[PDB]
């Protein structure tokens, strides 16, 4: 009903077309049987996190197996790995927007190709946070720039392109009310900055470069908190731009691991940090077995 | 003579620096007695390459030893590997500007507590050519944007810091001289278009969002020619921005797999890809070897 959608004519001009990333193709592979079933897909950095989510997901569905399963089923590029159990798969992109960029892509076309339709994708994720408590979960509303707007900019043969970065309201809402009835940790919805760089696009003050005080930064977070920003990340902005102009229903739930308006290091034992880390694991995983318990 | 700096005044005033993504720290670690020699470090994407650069460099100095050597000296980070032979360092720095952004951060600050000063710095790699033949090696004179100007634009707490992007002059020289000096490959001096995006960033036809025609994409890389442009990859911008600003002698050396003038994909053979990819190594490695032999 809402069929994932691509913008490009050149493609179906094409004699084949190769996933560089995923070394798969459509000579040899076919997409509709492969993953056509597909209706949930997460995404996150490593590939140890996309693979604890899909044994996750793959438990709590009754899709566990004796045997040694969720085999990788891409090749090429170790940045990416992709799992698969019943309609879910889990796809790790890597660090950075150039990295996660090149692999939704991908990625699209994939499900394109499948011909799938009412996909729901959800990136998963650590983050900073601002004026919240260590462990807090983030449901993204918009994933907004530098400035704090709610605007991707992308360069496209020298010109300048401004996509939006709203994530899919409804499913924001739907992954709002699992969380209010896990009732597991405290989860609360904004915007999330997406910064390019680590040491000076974050504010932090222990970079090789840094031409700022700890009280410009403070100001700065302060101004990010009032303009509606609650989480800092380096992934989800170019994620919300492709996802919506390609027919995705998207959204981001990041774990905080530490308060930036307290500083720039990471205070909580290892113990706690091992538990926040699990908990965008657990309201997506949890989210798309209710999903499946309705349908 | 030419030491390392930061310009950071934060860092003199901490108790200790992590350098995260390395698992190195300056409780811990002696970084004069680990890194104080240091006079050339050579960067690239993946851990293979810089393992296959640091093997490749350690037999031309007499350094290649019967045992199990060249052992990664990092952790903690996939994307990071380290190696290191005499006087030379070979680092991975993973895909995209941001993941380059952080290694380099956390290396300048290595280099620096290691008291390192003289310090060559040279990123290998592949990219796609302008108007060239594959297998053409290009040192870069200036790393420039989608525009074709030798500028990064730098967001720091939301305003724009722009940094010039040329490379070591004199570095470029000598580099020209060893690849007229070896006369085994074609070299050419030229600039570096670095763009963050590789499916539309780079004007290619497959992506899953194309605005655009094989004619638009022809007229975008014959401007990007006549503004000087020889070869397109993702990671050279940032790169030259912060070595310059942090008084490393930089350079990149990358080797160019395909003529993008004549289309998208790589034509050549497989073994003739493996050699070209060999270039930039062949180029560095023979640098350094004769700039220890004048020593
Ligand atoms: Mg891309
Ligand atoms: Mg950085």
Same mark, same amino acid.
């Given at each position: 009903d809402?069929?994932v959608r691509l913008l ?19 000579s040899?592979?076919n997409?509709?049987?492969?993953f056509?079933? @597909?209706?949930?897909?997460? =995404?996150?950095?490593? +590939? ?6 899909? *044994? ?6 009754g899709?566990?197996?004796?045997? *040694?399963?969720?085999? %990788? ?10 799992y698969?159990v019943?309609?879910?798969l ?8 150039p ?7 991908? $990625? ?11 996909? /729901? ?12 408590? +260590?462990?807090? @979960? @983030? ?9 704090? #707007? ?5 360069? @496209?043969?020298?010109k300048?392109?401004?996509? #939006? ?5 409804? !499913?924001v809402?739907?992954?709002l $009310?699992c969380?209010?009835? $896990?009732?597991?940790?405290? /989860? =609360?919805?904004? %915007? /999330?900055m997406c910064?390019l ?6 504010g ?6 840094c031409?700022?005080?700890? #009280?410009?930064?403070q ?6 908190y009032?303009?509606?920003?609650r ?5 989800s ?9 390609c027919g995705l ?5 990041? =774990? /905080? !691991?530490? %308060?930036?308006?307290?500083?720039? &290091? ?8 091992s538990?926040? &880390?699990?908990?965008?694991?657990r ?7 209710? #999903? $499946?318990?309705?349908?």
């Amino acid at each position: 009903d809402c069929p994932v959608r691509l913008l490009n004519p050149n493609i179906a001009k094409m004699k084949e077309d190769i996933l560089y990333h995923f070394n798969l193709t459509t000579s040899r592979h076919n997409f509709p049987a492969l993953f056509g079933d @597909v209706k949930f897909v997460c =995404v996150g950095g490593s +590939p140890s996190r996309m693979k604890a989510f899909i *044994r996750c997901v793959g438990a709590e569905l009754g899709l566990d197996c004796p045997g *040694r399963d969720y085999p %990788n089923i891409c090749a090429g590029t170790d940045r990416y790995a992709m799992y698969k159990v019943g309609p879910v798969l889990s796809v790790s992109h890597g660090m950075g927007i150039p990295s996660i960029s090149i692999m939704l892509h991908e $990625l699209i076309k994939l499900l394109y190709y499948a011909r799938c339709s009412n996909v /729901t994708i959800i990136r998963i994720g650590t983050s900073g946070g601002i004026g919240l408590e +260590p462990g807090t @979960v @983030v449901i993204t509303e918009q994933a907004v720039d530098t400035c704090f #707007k709610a605007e991707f900019e992308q360069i @496209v043969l020298g010109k300048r392109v401004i996509r #939006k970065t709203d994530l899919n309201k409804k !499913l924001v809402q739907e992954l709002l $009310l699992c969380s209010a009835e $896990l009732s597991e940790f405290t /989860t =609360v919805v904004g %915007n /999330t900055m997406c910064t390019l760089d680590f040491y000076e696009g974050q504010g932090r003050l222990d970079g090789a470069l840094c031409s700022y005080t700890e #009280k410009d930064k403070q100001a700065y977070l302060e101004a990010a908190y009032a303009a509606g920003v609650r989480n800092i990340e380096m992934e989800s902005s170019v994620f919300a731009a492709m996802c919506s102009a390609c027919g995705l229903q998207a959204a981001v739930v990041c =774990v /905080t !691991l530490l %308060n930036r308006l307290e500083g720039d &290091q990471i205070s909580s034992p290892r113990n706690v940090l091992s538990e926040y &880390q699990q908990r965008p694991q657990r309201l997506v995983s949890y989210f798309i077995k209710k #999903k $499946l318990s309705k349908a």
